[PDB]
Each structure stands twice: as structure tokens, then as C-alpha cells.
Design a protein around this nucleic acid. Sequence first.
RNA 1: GAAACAUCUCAGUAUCGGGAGGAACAGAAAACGCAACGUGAUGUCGUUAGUAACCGCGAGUGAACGCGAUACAGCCCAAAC
RNA 2: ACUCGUACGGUCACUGAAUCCUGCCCAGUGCAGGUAUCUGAACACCUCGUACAAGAGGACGAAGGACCUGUCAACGGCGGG
RNA 3: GCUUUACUGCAGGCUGUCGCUGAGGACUCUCACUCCGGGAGGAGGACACCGAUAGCCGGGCA
Lengths: 56, 194, 92, 237
Amino acid sequence: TGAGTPSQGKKNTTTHTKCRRCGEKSYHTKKKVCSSCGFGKSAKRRDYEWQSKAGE
Amino acid sequence: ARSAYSYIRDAWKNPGDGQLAELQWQRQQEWRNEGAVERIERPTRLDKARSQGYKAKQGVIVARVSVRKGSARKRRHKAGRRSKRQGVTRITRRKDIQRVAEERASRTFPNLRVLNSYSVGQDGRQKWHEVILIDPNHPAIQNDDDLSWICADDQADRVFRGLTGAGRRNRGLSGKGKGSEKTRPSLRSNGGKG
Amino acid sequence: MQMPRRFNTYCPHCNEHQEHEVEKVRSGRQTGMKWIDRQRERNSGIGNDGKFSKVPGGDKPTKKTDLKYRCGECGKAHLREGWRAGRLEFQE
Amino acid sequence: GRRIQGQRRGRGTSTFRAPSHRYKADLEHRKVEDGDVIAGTVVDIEHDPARSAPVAAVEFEDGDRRLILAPEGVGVGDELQVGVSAEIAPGNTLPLAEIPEGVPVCNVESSPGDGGKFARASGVNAQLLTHDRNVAVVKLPSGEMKRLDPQCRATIGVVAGGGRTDKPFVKAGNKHHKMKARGTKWPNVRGVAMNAVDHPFGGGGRQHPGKPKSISRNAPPGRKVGDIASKRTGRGG
RNA sequence: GAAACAUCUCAGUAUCGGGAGGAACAGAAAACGCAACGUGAUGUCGUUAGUAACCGCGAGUGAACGCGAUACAGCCCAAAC
RNA sequence: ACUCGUACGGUCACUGAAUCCUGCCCAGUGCAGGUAUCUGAACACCUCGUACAAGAGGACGAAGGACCUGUCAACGGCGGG
RNA sequence: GCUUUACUGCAGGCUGUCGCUGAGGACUCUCACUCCGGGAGGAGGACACCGAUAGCCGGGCA
Ligand SMILES: [Cl-]
Ligand SMILES: [Cl-]
Ligand SMILES: [Cl-]
Ligand SMILES: [Cl-]
Ligand SMILES: [K+]
Ligand SMILES: [Mg+2]
Ligand SMILES: [Mg+2]
Ligand SMILES: [Mg+2]
Ligand SMILES: [Mg+2]
Ligand SMILES: [Mg+2]
Ligand SMILES: [Mg+2]
Ligand SMILES: [Mg+2]
Ligand SMILES: [Mg+2]
Ligand SMILES: [Mg+2]
Ligand SMILES: [Mg+2]
Ligand SMILES: [Mg+2]
Ligand SMILES: [Mg+2]
Ligand SMILES: [Mg+2]
Ligand SMILES: [Mg+2]
Ligand SMILES: [Mg+2]
Ligand SMILES: [Mg+2]
Ligand code: NA
Ligand code: NA
Ligand code: NA
Ligand code: NA
Ligand code: NA
Ligand code: NA
Ligand code: NA
Ligand code: NA
Ligand SMILES: [Sr+2]
Ligand SMILES: [Sr+2]
Ligand SMILES: [Sr+2]
Ligand SMILES: [Sr+2]
Ligand SMILES: [Sr+2]
Ligand SMILES: [Sr+2]
Ligand SMILES: [Sr+2]
Ligand SMILES: [Sr+2]
Ligand SMILES: [Sr+2]
Ligand SMILES: [Sr+2]
Ligand SMILES: [Sr+2]
Ligand SMILES: [Sr+2]
Ligand SMILES: [Sr+2]
Ligand SMILES: [Sr+2]
Ligand SMILES: [Sr+2]
């Protein structure tokens, strides 16, 4: 069984869903954590300085 | 004449001698069985508390905080580093234990602001400090001429920004001349070389 | 090679020939208080210590004479350029 | 390199854990105040997944139903006694002090009241040798003379299920079923059969530990493999 | 970067944790030490100066007092009684 | 974590069903034990030095090493004449 | 990436020392502290744990 096309057929698991807090399809329904805004992980909003160039 | 307070002071100059030695030996047994932050009704060192700003008034709180003794509890480097940035054992943190204690206290009492703190001893594995906190929202304090300054907005979370006396000493702001070139007006503005 | 313990030669202090006594220079003990010593203590810590992590080199197959020429009259000594000598024994 | 298997274990992930959710109970001795007036009846005999040995269900006078570390010879209907004044009989529990010298014991406590620590596996037994007012000398299954507090409780007799070790597994599949009931990663891949990155003995064309196997006691984890602080090796000498 | 490299450099930089404000921080000398019969809280700007100092004394790192400016403001406890 | 586990246990390794067997070597390396004597850091102690301090030396000496011993189903070895 | 008796270091282990730490070169005690016990109480004990430092080992790791 190849890692490519043949293995893509088994993909029918729902994980990332629309997030109640930010509206992005990043709420991981299994972990119950939003990979975009961090809902379910932190009260504060997920944010990082590396999300932009250093001097901007 | 000598104040009654001067006696508490003089006793605390040598915590390992006299009656104080026995008091500490007794007390610590109880303290060791207490939590990280225990609110106390009266300061253990009255003279020191009053000297630091304490008042037997509404909105004044005193709490004893215990912190593990010694150096930094640091995790060794995952990725590659030069020998200089490889050390793990002898590296100590830049903030003293008293400062760690003040912050733990203020976090326990979110609505209160750290006024000052002092040491109340230690054993072989931990240190104890009593922190004086103030309620900036209580009128008994908003009306106090000696304490109402702590009610100002810019005094919010003062301990977390190093505005406490222990904060200022730890930041090397004691000296007004030689030696304070990289500390005043802030460590950050001097490129963090202090 | 051999060499006379005492012999007449020029003394730069008296500014005239006088009998001198030759002696091999004995190493003087260190005080451990020179600037270099303090730099070693200051700059040494965790990890590599730069120059202070280096260990002393080797030896040359033969060393140059290391001697003191002490004047027999004024008692003052003077140094001279040394010469490679596999061995140096004094006569008397 | 990479952390060796012995280090992966420490993390306590699923692969290395014991099937605790499937286990029955810790066969600790009952806690009696005094008087010995605690006896019970063996209501059933059960298999213990954690020890591959039978264990007995007892129903005590005061209404307590508990599983017991059963010695050989215990059967349903039999009455068991636990306490200072207990009768000196197989399956009965009482302190070493009340036990007569030269009597096989099992499930011996290390410190009075702990519930039993020594001699608990299939067929084994400790031997109560010397008595005293301050110390009871017991010979453990390993042959070691152990000095214990005479107040330490123990059960008379040898542990049930003796001779288990006498029959060979014969096939891998049999070992397999047993390992599924324990906290152990099985089968076992030899160090010498792995890559240099995976173990101190890996690498090199043909297989061989490129170094002596007897490792120092002071060796750090990751290096401490092979023959740990061996006083000697081989069969000769 | 040092034409390798380990002290050093990149740099207290990137990035991370915590926190305040419209600005922060600092601040009324246990100062300075152009040594004086002198200056007089604190920031900041210009300069002092790539100077003093550091440094496989290599590559590099690098102030301060003072001075000219900006703006100027000095006070409250603890204790004695 | 192992572990609702306790030497008929479980950890760490090697060999690889049964059958018949598995010799010699402890010098080196590894592990382990012992050790009169030798060596062996810091603190405290003593001598010199400094009205103090830096520093020099001394005494004592842990593990370790030297030294002895055990050990190859321990790393491995089993030649030339 | 990997190896080792390469260079230089870092974890970790062992060992001494100082603090915790008390009373009367070997010892006794209990009161801190530790462990067992539901509890009473028992075991141990100024040691061990822990903080600091020193010497040894140290491709386990950079
Ligand atoms: Cl605060
Ligand atoms: Cl010469
Ligand atoms: Cl098995
Ligand atoms: Cl001036
Ligand atoms: K670098
Ligand atoms: Mg049990
Ligand atoms: Mg399994
Ligand atoms: Mg295998
Ligand atoms: Mg392979
Ligand atoms: Mg490896
Ligand atoms: Mg092989
Ligand atoms: Mg370069
Ligand atoms: Mg530098
Ligand atoms: Mg600023
Ligand atoms: Mg160069
Ligand atoms: Mg710089
Ligand atoms: Mg200056
Ligand atoms: Mg094979
Ligand atoms: Mg095979
Ligand atoms: Mg416990
Ligand atoms: Mg490497
Ligand atoms: Na607070
Ligand atoms: Na320095
Ligand atoms: Na280059
Ligand atoms: Na390079
Ligand atoms: Na340098
Ligand atoms: Na001038
Ligand atoms: Na040998
Ligand atoms: Na590669
Ligand atoms: Sr496959
Ligand atoms: Sr699927
Ligand atoms: Sr969460
Ligand atoms: Sr953020
Ligand atoms: Sr806040
Ligand atoms: Sr330094
Ligand atoms: Sr170093
Ligand atoms: Sr040479
Ligand atoms: Sr148990
Ligand atoms: Sr229990
Ligand atoms: Sr190999
Ligand atoms: Sr043999
Ligand atoms: Sr002014
Ligand atoms: Sr075979
Ligand atoms: Sr040997």
C-alpha cells in the first residue's frame, strides 16, 4: 500500500471544525482546541510575533 | 526612650539566638505544614511592617509566602549550543527569591497591590517572606494620606513591573552614581546589560 | 659543554673588567597576585575558558644557556644572550 | 543518538504500562484494631491476572468481602483467622511474633501494617527462623537472611500456584498472552541487532558489542546497558 | 564575524512568559570627586568619545563625570514625644 | 512508569527449538572486591606573609588511582621461531 | 548523521565539606527532619532527603 493516492481513501475523519470563538475552521473537535485562536487552550487569544517579519 | 518595636527589631537581628531561636524552631514546624500563600492576621515582625508602611487599618493584608530554596530549576538544551550556553547546574536566576514570593502573593490576591515585603526566615529547603498588600478599592485606604497613592491606575500590578522596593533593589537602582550606568532609568532601555 | 665558575670579564655596572661568578638562573616563585592571575579567575567559569583552557606547550631539543654573571666586587649581576648548550657543567 | 528503549519506558506511555484497569485488587492484609475477633469464610477462588496465581475471596464476620493472597491448600468453606490470637494454621494471618519458629510463611510485611511486601509470587515462601523480643529473623525466597520487626504480619504457608515456572512456554504465542497481562514491551530486539544510533551495542558490519558489556554503576541512563555492575560474569571461576 | 574555532562576536538581538499607561520607567544623594572657597532630584537631546575601560590584548566590544540644551518641583512615612 | 507487581519477581544484556557438546588465556581493556604503604580537592586547623586581605607552605585525607584479588556464556585472544 | 582512550565542555553517578542541625576519633540521647500506621503508636534520627561546593568517573549529551 503506497503512502500516496491509495492512503488518501481512508481519510474520512472530522477533526478541524468551525470555531465558536473566532469563526475559523480550526477548532479541533477531538482535542477541543482551536489551532487558530487558541480557544479551549487559553483565555487570551493565540498570537505570535513570528506571524510577521521581525521589524514589522 | 526605646520603643517597644525596637525590641522586636533587635531580636530579629540575630534570629538564631535567644527566644527568637526557639520561636522559629517551633513555628517552622507549622509553616512547613501550611500552603504556598497563607494570609495572616498580624505581621510576625511588627516593627518591620510598620516601618515598611503597614497600618492596623481596613484594606491592609499580610500574607506569608514560602518558596523553594536555591538556584534556578532549568531544563538542559535540546538543540546545539556553544559550551558557554550549555551550562545548567550553576546558573541562577536574575530575580531574587523575595521577588518571586511577592509575585506569588499578588497573584493570590488579584485585587490587591504589593506594598512591600520582608524576610521571616528559612530552613534548609525553603524561605519564608511576609508580604504587605493593599486594597486600592477600599475607602479606608482611598482616604488614607499615607497610602492613597497606591490607588492610582499606574500602580496596577506594580509588583509585576518591578516597582516594589525589592524590585528596585534587584534592578540595581540603589546607587545614584557610579555603577548605575546600565540600570537607570530601566534595564530594558539600557539594552538589558544591567 | 664545560665552563669556568669564575673568570674576568666586563662588568657594565663598574664599567671595567672584574672577576665574575656565573650561576644558572633559578626560577623565582610566583605570588599568584599578578594581573594575569586575576584575569584567569575573572574570565574562567562555565564551558570553555578561551586562552585559560589551553595547556602549556612542549620543549625544544636543546635550550640556550640561562645564566647570571655576578661581579665579584660590587656584587651586582648582569644578563647575557644565551647560546644553545645540550648541557652546561661548571669547572669549580 | 536516540534515547534507548529503557529510557522510553520511564515516560510511562501506554506501550509500557500494565493493564491496571483489568487488575482485580491489591492483596493487602486486613486492618484489625485488636482482639483478633476477625475471622471469615472463603467464598470463592479466583484467578489473579497480575500474578498468574489463584487468589481467594473471603467474607469476614463484620460484613467485609475482600480478596486474599492465598497460600496453597485454601478452599471454599474454610474459615480464616486474622489477628494476634489467630490459630496457627495455613491461610491464617498474624504477626511474626505469634508465629512459631521453623514455619513457612508468605506475604510478609516490611514495616508493620503495610499489608505485605515479601514472598507473594507463585509457590514461594519465607522461612521464619529466629525469634526475639526486638527482631524476627526471616529467610526470604532469594536465600537472604532478613531481620524484621516481630510486629510484621504474615500468612502461614507457601503461596498457591507453585511449579508454574516448571512448564516451558513452548511457543512465542504463549509468551505473548502472558506479556499482555503485564507492564512490559515484548518481544525483545537485541541491542547488537540495532543501529549505532539506537543502542551502545549497535552498528558495525557483523553483529557484536564493540566494547566490554560490564558497565559501571555510575554510568548514566542511556549508557547503562549490558551487564550492570557485574561482580563477575560467565559460569566458570 | 573572528576568513577554521572553543573565550569573544552576531546580541541581551529573534523569539517566549508576565504587566501598566497615554505615554511608560526614573527621580529629590549613605550623589558627584573638571579635588573644589566647586556642582546640587530625574529623564532626554547635542557633545565629551570610539576617549577611559574590556579583549585567544585577536577580531571586535565600549561607558562616565563634566559641558551646551530641553523641561524644571519638590515632598510623604517609620521612630522619638 | 515498572506496580492492584515482590526473587516461581522484573529489570539489563547475550545466544537462538530439540540432540551431543561448549577446551585454553585475567597480560591489556571493562566490571567488581580488597588494600599496610604511596598518591589524592575543598571547608575547618596550624606556620609565614598582610595592623586586615590577597598569597606561600604545612598537617589531616573521601571517593579515585598506584598495588593485590576475583571474573571470558566480559571486551576479546588462541602466533613466529 | 555516526564513532572513539580526538579537542573542549555539559548532564548524570559516586565521594568529602558547609547549611538544614538539636541535647548529653569513638559513643549515647530526642526535639527537628524522614518512613510505617486509620489511630494510638512504631521504626529511624541529627543521619538520610534537600540547597551549596569540591575531587573522581563521565560520547549518555552538545
Ligand atoms: Cl501588585
Ligand atoms: Cl644554563
Ligand atoms: Cl515470563
Ligand atoms: Cl561639578
Ligand atoms: K557561536
Ligand atoms: Mg496487594
Ligand atoms: Mg500489551
Ligand atoms: Mg531477540
Ligand atoms: Mg540493521
Ligand atoms: Mg550511540
Ligand atoms: Mg555476537
Ligand atoms: Mg567563523
Ligand atoms: Mg564581554
Ligand atoms: Mg526611558
Ligand atoms: Mg585569528
Ligand atoms: Mg557591549
Ligand atoms: Mg563618573
Ligand atoms: Mg546471531
Ligand atoms: Mg538470527
Ligand atoms: Mg507516604
Ligand atoms: Mg558528538
Ligand atoms: Na494583585
Ligand atoms: Na567580572
Ligand atoms: Na569565515
Ligand atoms: Na566551519
Ligand atoms: Na575575549
Ligand atoms: Na568647565
Ligand atoms: Na586479561
Ligand atoms: Na548525514
Ligand atoms: Sr508491510
Ligand atoms: Sr477512516
Ligand atoms: Sr486546556
Ligand atoms: Sr502572543
Ligand atoms: Sr491586571
Ligand atoms: Sr566573571
Ligand atoms: Sr570552565
Ligand atoms: Sr620537541
Ligand atoms: Sr501494596
Ligand atoms: Sr495501603
Ligand atoms: Sr556494534
Ligand atoms: Sr570455564
Ligand atoms: Sr531643578
Ligand atoms: Sr541448541
Ligand atoms: Sr583483568
